[PDB]
Amino acid sequence: AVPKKRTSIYKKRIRKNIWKKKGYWAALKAFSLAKSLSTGNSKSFFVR
Template identity: 65%
Template sequence: MAVPKKRTSRSKKKIRKNVWLNKTNEIALKALSLAKSILTNRSKSFYYGINNELDNNLPKSISNNQE
């Protein structure tokens, strides 16, 4: 005979939701920090080979930083 499961409490739902939100916020902050370091040419973990074709398509503000 089937028995209904117990209902999850609101506090447990909030805890699980906050854990998930904190993980996503941490990942988003790391991605933003990495993007900032790449844009300001402070990143030491990436090496780029620049082609003239790619350089011509970049906006002037970005292409001036790489020279």
């Protein structure tokens, strides 16, 4: 099956923005993790 038409500019921008939103949730995990290693109290975690 092929694409009978070509995908319009704006719709494509919406789909790719959806794929860019996962970056937002990743940035939240990363931030929380940083604030956890920034106290040096975690015994479950280790860095070198």
